[PDB]
Structure prediction request, 611 residues.
Amino acid sequence: YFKSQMKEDPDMASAVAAIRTLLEFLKRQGLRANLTSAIETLCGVDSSVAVSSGGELFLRFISSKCKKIMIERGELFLRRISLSRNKIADLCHTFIKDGATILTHAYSRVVLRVLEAAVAAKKRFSVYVTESQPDLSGKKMAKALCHLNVPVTVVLDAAVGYIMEKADLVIVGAEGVVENGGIINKIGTNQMAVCAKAQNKPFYVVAESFKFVRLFPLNQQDVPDKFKYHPWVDYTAPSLITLLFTDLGVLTPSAVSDELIKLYL
Amino acid sequence: DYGSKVSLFSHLPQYSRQNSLTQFMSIPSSVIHPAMVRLGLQYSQGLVSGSNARCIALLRALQQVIQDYTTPPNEELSRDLVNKLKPYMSFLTQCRPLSASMHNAIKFLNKEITSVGSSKREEEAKSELRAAIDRYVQEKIVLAAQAISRFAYQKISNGDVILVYGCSSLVSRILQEAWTEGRRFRVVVVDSRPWLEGRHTLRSLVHAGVPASYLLIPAASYVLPEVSKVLLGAHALLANGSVMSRVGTAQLALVARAHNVPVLVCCETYKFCERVQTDAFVSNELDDPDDLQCKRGEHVALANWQNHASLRLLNLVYDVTPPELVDLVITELGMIPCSSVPVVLR
Prediction:
């Protein structure tokens, strides 16, 4: 379709942009084939799990002379997805303590919104960010966080185990939530979760509802190769995750499977 | 024995405090030495319960016994003394089970006595035995705590939150010496029933000026998050690396590990035994069961517990901690791992 500029304004995630593009292209049965055509085309530009998750969600929602109901439902769903982040932040900002130390891996709008909502409540805390060697997004996150009057500190990607004892909790964003409960995030997430599990450190995850992908990876190789491409993503088991803060509420790693089953995706 | 024991603890003696063993004995004790008689009476009544205090009292009583020991004719003393000291140890054990410190001390004394030749005079032998006991005490008890006090001083930092348990003559000394050197920290004293001996350490710390806290062991999981170190004292270090200490030590170390807190242990080299143990069931000590009775509210619930033939009262004293929960051990030789006890025994 048109160029990747519906994301001209940066804030907005890639999955929301893909959903908007799909909804607008719907206003142009046999829809199914055309739409699958469209999702697939869309995916060439972005090898990301969130885009595919949103596409599959929209395809399931589509399940053709009665197009009024579909357009109305799509508009309502888009509004809900837009309000996703405020709800996630308002519900997760309560699990942060005054004077506690937080550890983040890479840049994410959700964790940034959570931190800003927590500091807006007259809370003081220190945050440790990993440099994200693949692409220097940790430095960007630290720069965007230093402006919020937070004592941020940047640590090397290899030094995630050296500062694990100082951290009190671990919070990171997930690009895609697998059925069992695991998450598909940056390459430097599984090792951090493993190091945190060995020290009884809570491992929290924040993610929206349009990232629930219906996959079941058994190991680091069962994940689709198109999403990894020096890989750019890894899988984390649910046994290393404490809770999940989504727009639907605070749930356990064993609750996303219930949602996917109720959805019959 | 007094009362009904537990099915799993039926191979250990359960004595009582009211039942004294001096009833069926002559007021001037003929078969037993008066010094050892009063020592056993004190052990049974609980007048001396410290690990090192018990050994010191035993050695002083043995010195007193040797001072007034006459070797019969027709035999040497190097063997007569060893043959005579055995019934005294048996009577002491009957009064209260002996500890690893007392065992090692009596072993060393028997070895020293056997090292005495019949070529020497009686007075010289007695004087040499007394001097040997004195210098052994000074080395393994007095001088064995000054090196541990300056070794643990390095691991203590300003702002630390050290957590101790029970009563130990070495932990209190370490803390009181580290506080006077310049360190500024605060201690958390954990105690358990029914002995409640941690109040001794609490008072000894309050009199020294160290900020201290007090709480029962069930709440150890609530205060450990703020704790930085756990300094514990034990009674014996087994040959398999394990540690034998008060009953409320293994679970404390477990919770500390669960909260990711480094656990330490301080023991003297003379407490390094040679045996091994895997749990607190094969060799333990059951004290008087009536100690669990408590005046809670308006009346006691275990006032006539013996009327219920099915009810048992367990009063374990010692416990065994696995080497998987101990990080460092402090001795006069230096800081050694938990799995280096046999090396020191060598």
